[PDB]
Amino acid sequence: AHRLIAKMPTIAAMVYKYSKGEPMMYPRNDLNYAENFLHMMFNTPCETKPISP
Amino acid sequence: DKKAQLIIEGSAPVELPVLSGTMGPDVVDVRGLTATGHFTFDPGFMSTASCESKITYIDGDKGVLLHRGYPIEQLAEKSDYLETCYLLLNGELPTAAQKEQFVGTIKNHTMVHEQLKTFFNGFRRDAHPMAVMCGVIGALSAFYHDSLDINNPKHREVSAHRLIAKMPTIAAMVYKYSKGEPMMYPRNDLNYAENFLHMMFNTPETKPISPVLAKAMDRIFILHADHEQNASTSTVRLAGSSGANPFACIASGIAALWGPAHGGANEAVLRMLDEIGDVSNIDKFVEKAKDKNDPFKLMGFGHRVYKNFDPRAKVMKQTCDEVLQELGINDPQLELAMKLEEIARHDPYFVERNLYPNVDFYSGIILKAIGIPTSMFTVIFALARTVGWISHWQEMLSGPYKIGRPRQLYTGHTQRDFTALKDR
Amino acid sequence: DKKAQLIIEGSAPVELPVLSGTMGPDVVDVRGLTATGHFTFDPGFMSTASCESKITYIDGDKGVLLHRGYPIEQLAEKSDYLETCYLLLNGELPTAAQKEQFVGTIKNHTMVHEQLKTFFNGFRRDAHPMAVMCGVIGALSAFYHDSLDINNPKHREVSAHRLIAKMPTIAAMVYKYSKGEPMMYPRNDLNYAENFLHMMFNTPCETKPISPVLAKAMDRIFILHADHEQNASTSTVRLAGSSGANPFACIASGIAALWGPAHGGANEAVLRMLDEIGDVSNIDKFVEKAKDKNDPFKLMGFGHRVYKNFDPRAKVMKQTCDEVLQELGINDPQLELAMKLEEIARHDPYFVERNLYPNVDFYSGIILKAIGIPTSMFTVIFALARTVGWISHWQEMLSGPYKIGRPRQLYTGHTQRDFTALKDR
């Protein structure tokens, strides 16, 4: 259950980043669940800017 | 207004309309010739005007090169590469608003589609950078083609932006690949030149870029932005006239530029310095050059167009001296080069022959000094010229063009029947 | 022998040497113009002769197209593609010995370097075949460059062979890739055309034999597209090559140019016409729709801008089409439609009098479709055939004394003006 709840966001992000043809992003332990998701979704290794609360 | 009578001696006289321009020479309209049953003969098109243009004007005798009316030396001294890009594309210099928006868009398109990474894996790491470029950006066609309406100016505009933005990223990938180092991504907090140098030399330690080197690079880009009609530029136009995809046309341009005759001066001047080897035997090779009988001649001295002086030369000298001020001329080949320069400038033979150290000599030295290998020199050229090519393509298409079928002079055999295997 | 006086009105008269050729019109040497401070003006170079050539001669008015003196119809009727390749490259037809050796070499170079397979994986499978070709053979440069001495005729020769041999294999790989099928290798026991069709349609699942009718039809299609004098693509190859550029790169430039709808999209156009018709039932509808001057609809693949009266290739192409459809048996309603449209066009007074005859492009489009090639590939087949022409024209100019082409322009832009700084705008 933990594995699923934890990985699903990372995978969902990978799908989006893949469709776009952008490089896939890794998670960050210093961001909460929602923040992390949005980071993995829209941020890049180009510029890692902070997420709107 | 004016007319020109052509009397062929065999045929009757024909009226050819002579057209003038904003500046430069007048031109004689020869489109009527095929009607009278003749062609003009022009190996290399050296006396034939392909088109109307209002992008870049050149007058070698006077030492004049100007983009949209602005002299190259002024742009190089004052503006930056992206401002010059805007000028070449849009026809006037930008406002702060126009500039902001343009730079923004260019920064938006800088990242390259991850699929392309696997493309490079189809090359040998020792493969020629220009071959890699020719292939890679030739393949970009496949990625930006389905939407692309060649006749829609919005599509032309976005295609130009895409090219200007991606070319540095790709050029960097070529270098990083040849080295066997991991390929670097762009950074929105760095300017064009800075970004290029970052992608080139930094790794996943990310140390800051020298403003001196960055500025020098930017100037090099400005000074190679466009150079009127030439092998590559005209190849882009000729290919493009069929209604061909822009990226493909640029790939044609790179193929043409790769040719040693078109873009290998930077390499040539370095091979000269290799041939010299040591400072100790500079005089030896100076006399060897001066010897009419000896195939040796100095490279990067004088110019076939800008006979008296190249307006870019001064600015390039400044930049070279400024770069070597920071780096220190550690290399003995660089030391050799600056001595050769000293000699050439303060020597009566070279002075009287108008054999001044040119843009290619200085730029070769700079690029080498700041760490670019000779193999890449032509890729840096291509990088800078891209904006010129696409600007000329944009102009051609924005006007009312025509496919473009060059004629020939037939000197082969007369019509003959098929000689059976027995006769041969 | 002859001279031509050019009077500019603004300037004093100038003497231009008028040069003649083995056949065709005379030419007026304008290289002296830049000395007098003028240029010629020629959008599209339609009245400007780029060079001397002895490869292909054309006279549209007379319906004449001949390679090395040999008419296209004779070559198409008698010789094969590789014999025609030898002709275009070497200047005369081969002996049995010369032929044997040439075919042998071509068969030696047919296999492609395994590294290139991974190149295709950098494309989308739905990507345009011509884009893929432009990229792939553009990358070949990297593989055959280090040895390659552009000035050495042996290197030129082997480069030409490599190209003529590999292009089919590559073209096949493009198709097999788009489909998502496994890419096929060549076979030394099959002739050029046979081999191509094998690589195209056969699988490692079942390697069944190739129709001699289809193979022969394909071969003739190749012959009839081998070279066509100076044109967008051919001249692009020459212009690029003039800088001393790698041959493979120059061919890549040619493919880029040919891709242009204007240069090489007639085969596609004629098919789009048949799509627009749709059914046989409404042929008459679209016939009148075409005849309507006011209506943007016009028939595609009928008549020709050069070969106004007749195309010498048309007859042989008709023969080939009828022969192919004899074997396959017009299963497709679009093919049925096409042959009816042909019947009409030929036996109709309007089209007869307008010289709107079914042309090489119409017939070849139908054939290629009938034998299974998708419309996307049509231009790749063109490129395949033309490769030999391009490299022959490249070989010719390089073998001659050449000067880096640097055309001129007519400046109609701003006049010298100072740089206004960013804060003054």
Side-chain angles (χ1 to χ4, degrees), chain B residues 68-81:
Chain B
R68 307 298 196 174
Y70 299 91
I72 189 61
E73 57 268 42
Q74 290 191 21
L75 294 174
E77 282 269 16
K78 303 196 172 72
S79 75
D80 87 294
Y81 180 61

Side-chain angles (χ1 to χ4, degrees), chain C residues 159-177:
Chain C
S159 285
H161 295 153
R162 280 185 208 285
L163 281 162
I164 293 166
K166 290 170 199 304
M167 207 66 61
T169 309
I170 300 297
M173 283 179 176
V174 174
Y175 175 73
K176 301 301 296 207
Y177 184 79

Side-chain angles (χ1 to χ4, degrees), chain A residues 5-18:
Chain A
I5 294 166
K7 290 170 199 304
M8 207 66 61
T10 308
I11 300 182
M14 283 179 175
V15 173
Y16 175 73
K17 301 301 296 207
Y18 184 96

Side-chain angles (χ1 to χ4, degrees), chain B residues 2-9 20-23 25-31 33-34 37-58 66 68-71 74-75 78-79 83 91-96 115 118-119 121-124 127-128 131 134-135 138-139 141-143 145 228-231 234-235 238-239 242-245 248 252 255-256 258-262 392 403-419 421 424, chain C residues 3-9 20-23 25-31 33-34 37-58 66 68-71 74-75 78-79 83 91-96 115 118-119 121-124 127-128 131 134-135 138-139 141-143 145 229-232 235-236 239-240 243-246 249 253 256-257 259-263 393 403-420 422 425:
Chain B
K2 296 148 180 181
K3 298 154 278 306
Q5 201 83 342
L6 175 64
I7 51 163
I8 295 100
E9 183 178 2
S20 179
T22 48
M23 41 174 53
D26 295 12
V27 204
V28 182
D29 190 350
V30 297
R31 283 173 287 184
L33 264 286
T34 305
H38 292 297
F39 309 137
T40 69
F41 192 66
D42 203 345
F45 310 101
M46 297 189 295
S47 310
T48 287
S50 52
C51 55
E52 281 171 23
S53 179
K54 42 187 74 193
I55 304 175
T56 296
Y57 170 94
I58 298 183
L66 37 85
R68 307 298 196 174
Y70 299 91
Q74 290 191 21
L75 294 174
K78 303 196 172 72
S79 75
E83 185 161 10
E92 312 294 355
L93 292 170
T95 55
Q115 195 77 1
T118 61
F119 255 108
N121 297 12
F123 285 99
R124 306 158 58 81
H128 199 285
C134 178
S141 323
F143 289 86
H145 181 79
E228 206 229 38
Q229 305 297 325
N230 54 77
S234 294
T235 289
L238 187 56
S242 57
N245 166 291
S252 316
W258 188 7
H262 196 3
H392 277 269
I403 314 345
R405 182 179 180 274
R407 314 310 305 268
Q408 71 187 19
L409 170 49
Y410 192 68
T411 62
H413 295 83
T414 301
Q415 181 173 355
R416 45 156 151 177
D417 295 341
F418 172 88
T419 80
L421 202 170
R424 292 173 296 180
Chain C
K3 298 157 184 175
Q5 201 83 342
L6 175 64
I7 298 167
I8 290 305
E9 207 191 346
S20 179
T22 48
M23 41 196 307
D26 294 14
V27 203
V28 184
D29 191 350
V30 297
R31 284 173 288 184
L33 264 287
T34 305
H38 291 298
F39 309 136
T40 69
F41 193 66
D42 202 346
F45 310 100
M46 295 269 291
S47 310
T48 287
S50 53
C51 54
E52 281 194 28
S53 178
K54 42 173 63 44
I55 304 175
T56 296
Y57 170 85
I58 298 183
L66 37 85
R68 307 299 196 174
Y70 299 92
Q74 291 191 21
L75 294 174
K78 302 185 79 67
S79 75
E83 183 178 2
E92 312 294 356
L93 295 169
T95 55
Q115 195 77 359
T118 61
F119 210 76
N121 297 11
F123 285 99
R124 307 160 57 81
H128 199 285
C134 178
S141 323
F143 289 86
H145 182 79
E229 206 230 38
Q230 305 297 325
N231 54 77
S235 294
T236 289
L239 187 56
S243 58
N246 166 291
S253 316
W259 187 7
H263 197 348
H393 276 269
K403 248 275 139 40
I404 187 167
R406 181 179 180 274
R408 315 309 305 268
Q409 71 184 23
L410 170 49
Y411 192 68
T412 61
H414 276 184
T415 59
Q416 169 61 25
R417 293 182 183 174
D418 297 338
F419 181 84
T420 82
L422 175 36
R425 303 160 179 149

Side-chain angles (χ1 to χ4, degrees), chain B residues 95-389:
Chain B
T95 55
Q98 283 161 296
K99 180 84 162 287
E100 275 293 347
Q101 203 74 41
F102 179 74
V103 172
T105 312
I106 296 287
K107 292 209 181 200
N108 281 333
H109 293 293
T110 38
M111 265 201 157
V112 174
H113 196 276
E114 278 288 309
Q115 195 77 1
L116 264 59
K117 270 183 164 63
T118 61
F119 255 108
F120 287 81
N121 297 12
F123 285 99
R124 306 158 58 81
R125 287 179 189 281
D126 55 33
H128 199 285
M130 286 294 282
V132 178
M133 290 292 293
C134 178
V136 169
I137 70 131
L140 269 185
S141 323
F143 289 86
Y144 314 105
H145 181 79
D146 294 4
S147 73
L148 256 71
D149 173 356
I150 183 162
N151 291 333
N152 188 330
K154 261 281 174 288
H155 288 84
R156 263 136 53 183
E157 170 177 55
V158 82
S159 286
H161 295 153
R162 280 184 208 286
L163 281 162
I164 294 166
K166 290 170 199 304
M167 207 65 61
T169 299
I170 300 182
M173 284 178 175
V174 174
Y175 176 73
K176 301 301 296 207
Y177 184 79
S178 76
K179 224 79 174 185
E181 287 175 17
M183 312 196 205
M184 291 289 292
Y185 294 113
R187 269 171 60 186
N188 281 41
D189 52 59
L190 297 170
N191 58 61
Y192 198 86
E194 271 192 329
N195 195 42
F196 179 80
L197 291 170
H198 166 68
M199 300 192 84
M200 201 66 36
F201 300 114
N202 268 304
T203 46
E205 54 172 50
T206 303
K207 64 216 306 193
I209 302 302
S210 156
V212 175
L213 301 197
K215 191 219 292 286
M217 211 62 171
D218 193 275
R219 293 182 183 174
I220 288 168
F221 299 160
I222 291 164
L223 298 168
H224 293 68
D226 184 54
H227 209 272
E228 206 229 38
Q229 305 297 325
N230 54 77
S232 62
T233 301
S234 294
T235 289
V236 171
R237 291 205 144 176
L238 187 56
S241 64
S242 57
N245 166 291
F247 294 87
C249 301
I250 302 305
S252 316
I254 293 183
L257 190 71
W258 188 7
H262 196 3
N266 294 159
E267 299 181 356
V269 63
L270 258 293
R271 264 187 299 283
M272 186 200 70
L273 300 171
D274 288 353
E275 278 209 300
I276 313 300
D278 185 343
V279 173
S280 65
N281 55 319
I282 285 172
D283 291 353
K284 177 204 168 181
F285 279 107
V286 167
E287 269 58 74
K288 205 173 195 302
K290 290 196 196 182
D291 192 59
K292 301 149 179 282
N293 295 142
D294 197 299
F296 199 101
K297 305 166 286 182
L298 293 188
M299 297 290 90
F301 291 92
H303 212 288
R304 278 229 281 264
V305 185
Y306 305 104
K307 299 198 172 189
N308 297 19
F309 76 97
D310 190 321
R312 308 172 285 178
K314 63 180 72 206
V315 175
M316 283 299 301
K317 169 155 71 71
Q318 176 211 305
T319 299
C320 177
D321 293 3
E322 186 151 314
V323 166
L324 295 176
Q325 263 290 157
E326 183 157 308
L327 274 87
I329 324 128
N330 194 31
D331 191 295
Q333 214 159 91
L334 269 45
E335 186 200 21
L336 194 171
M338 296 308 287
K339 286 155 162 52
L340 219 162
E341 181 227 285
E342 278 281 311
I343 292 157
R345 279 163 54 260
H346 306 93
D347 184 301
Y349 170 77
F350 294 98
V351 164
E352 291 171 332
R353 294 292 177 141
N354 283 332
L355 298 167
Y356 60 90
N358 74 15
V359 54
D360 297 287
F361 172 89
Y362 287 126
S363 66
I365 293 161
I366 294 162
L367 290 172
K368 172 153 150 46
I370 73 172
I372 281 82
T374 50
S375 55
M376 293 287 303
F377 284 3
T378 189
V379 179
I380 274 63
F381 199 155
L383 190 93
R385 185 62 69 83
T386 291
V387 66
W389 291 332

Side-chain angles (χ1 to χ4, degrees), chain C residues 106-420:
Chain C
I106 296 288
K107 292 209 183 200
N108 281 332
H109 293 293
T110 37
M111 264 202 158
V112 172
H113 196 276
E114 278 289 310
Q115 195 77 359
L116 263 60
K117 270 183 164 63
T118 61
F119 210 76
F120 287 80
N121 297 11
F123 285 99
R124 307 160 57 81
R125 287 179 190 280
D126 55 33
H128 199 285
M130 286 294 282
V132 178
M133 289 292 293
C134 178
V136 169
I137 70 131
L140 268 185
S141 323
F143 289 86
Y144 314 105
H145 182 79
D146 294 4
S147 73
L148 196 146
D149 174 356
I150 183 162
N151 291 333
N152 188 330
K154 260 285 198 293
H155 289 83
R156 262 136 54 182
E157 171 174 57
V158 82
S159 285
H161 295 153
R162 280 185 208 285
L163 281 162
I164 293 166
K166 290 170 199 304
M167 207 66 61
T169 309
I170 300 297
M173 283 179 176
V174 174
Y175 175 73
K176 301 301 296 207
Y177 184 79
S178 76
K179 224 78 173 187
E181 287 176 17
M183 311 191 211
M184 292 288 292
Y185 294 113
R187 269 171 60 186
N188 280 42
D189 51 60
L190 297 170
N191 58 61
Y192 199 85
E194 271 191 329
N195 195 41
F196 179 79
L197 292 171
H198 166 68
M199 300 193 277
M200 201 67 35
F201 300 114
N202 268 304
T203 46
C205 170
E206 54 149 53
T207 302
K208 63 179 169 178
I210 302 302
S211 156
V213 175
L214 301 196
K216 192 149 180 71
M218 211 61 172
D219 193 276
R220 293 182 183 174
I221 287 168
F222 299 160
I223 291 164
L224 298 168
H225 294 68
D227 184 54
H228 209 271
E229 206 230 38
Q230 305 297 325
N231 54 77
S233 62
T234 301
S235 294
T236 289
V237 171
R238 291 204 143 177
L239 187 56
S242 81
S243 58
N246 166 291
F248 295 91
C250 301
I251 301 305
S253 316
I255 293 183
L258 190 71
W259 187 7
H263 197 348
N267 294 158
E268 300 185 342
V270 63
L271 257 293
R272 264 187 299 283
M273 186 200 71
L274 299 171
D275 288 353
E276 278 189 62
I277 313 300
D279 185 343
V280 173
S281 65
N282 55 319
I283 285 172
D284 292 352
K285 177 179 180 297
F286 279 107
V287 168
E288 269 57 74
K289 205 172 193 304
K291 290 196 196 182
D292 192 59
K293 295 202 73 176
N294 295 142
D295 197 299
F297 199 102
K298 49 178 172 189
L299 293 188
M300 298 290 88
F302 291 92
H304 212 288
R305 280 197 276 265
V306 184
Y307 305 104
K308 299 154 199 187
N309 297 19
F310 76 97
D311 190 320
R313 308 173 284 178
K315 178 59 193 62
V316 175
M317 282 299 301
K318 170 158 190 83
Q319 176 182 303
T320 311
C321 180
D322 294 3
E323 186 172 317
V324 166
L325 295 177
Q326 263 290 157
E327 183 157 308
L328 283 134
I330 312 169
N331 292 288
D332 185 295
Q334 214 159 91
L335 269 45
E336 186 199 21
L337 194 170
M339 296 308 286
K340 286 155 163 293
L341 219 161
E342 182 227 73
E343 278 281 311
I344 292 157
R346 279 162 54 260
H347 306 93
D348 184 301
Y350 170 77
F351 294 99
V352 164
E353 291 171 332
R354 294 294 177 278
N355 283 332
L356 299 166
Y357 60 88
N359 74 15
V360 54
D361 298 287
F362 172 88
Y363 287 126
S364 66
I366 293 162
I367 294 162
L368 290 172
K369 173 152 148 49
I371 73 174
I373 282 81
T375 50
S376 55
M377 293 287 303
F378 285 3
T379 319
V380 179
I381 274 63
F382 199 156
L384 190 93
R386 186 62 69 83
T387 290
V388 67
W390 291 332
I391 202 70
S392 298
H393 276 269
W394 180 78
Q395 270 194 10
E396 186 175 56
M397 67 174 282
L398 266 145
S399 63
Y402 69 92
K403 248 275 139 40
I404 187 167
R406 181 179 180 274
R408 315 309 305 268
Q409 71 184 23
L410 170 49
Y411 192 68
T412 61
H414 276 184
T415 59
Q416 169 61 25
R417 293 182 183 174
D418 297 338
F419 181 84
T420 82

